Design a binder for this molecule. Structure first.
Ligand code: A1B4G
Ligand code: ZN
Length: 140
């Protein structure tokens, strides 16, 4: 589990969104595994607006933050899980690192801010849904 809290937005994995998220929906995209809902309180996270391909992510199944090198956002084939059939997920970045299904939502960040959240995994790989192209998170 986990979310990004930027401005009056809450960014979560679409497959983990709650009824309150769906009832206060701003934007969702199944192909990216992302959903954004509105919040009453202002959040403290800042979104990275950069080209970094190194950063650090939080792994709840180890209670640890790990440094990683990750690929550029791309269209990657992801195996079937409890939440999606086997399909192509867009704007996904891969790294070598530990992840279990409940690790989804952990933040990946660089010196510029939040880069994305854990969305996929297995066999010593971890995949992150990028948010750096969602410029509208910084306003309105
Ligand atoms: C064996 C294994 N499968 C893992 C998944 C699979 N997965 C893919 C998600 C997606 N975005 O398609 C939907 C939810 C989900 O559980 C992880 F996300 C993380 C670690 C994993 N280890
Ligand atoms: Zn950066």
């Amino acid at each position: 589990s986990g979310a990004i809290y930027v401005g009056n937005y809450r960014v979560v994995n679409r497959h983990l969104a709650t009824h309150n998220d769906w009832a206060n929906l701003v934007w969702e995209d199944s192909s990216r595994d992302l959903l954004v809902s509105s919040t009453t309180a202002q959040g403290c996270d800042t979104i990275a607006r950069c080209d970094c391909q190194t950063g650090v992510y939080y792994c709840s199944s180890r209670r640890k933050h790990y440094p990683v090198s990750f690929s550029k956002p791309s269209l990657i084939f992801v195996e079937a899980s409890e939440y999606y059939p086997a399909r192509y997920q867009s704007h996904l970045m891969l790294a070598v690192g530990h992840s279990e299904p409940g690790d989804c939502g952990g933040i990946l960040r660089c010196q510029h801010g939040v880069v994305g959240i854990v969305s996929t995994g297995g066999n010593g790989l971890v995949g992150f849904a990028d948010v750096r192209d969602l410029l509208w998170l910084d306003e309105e």
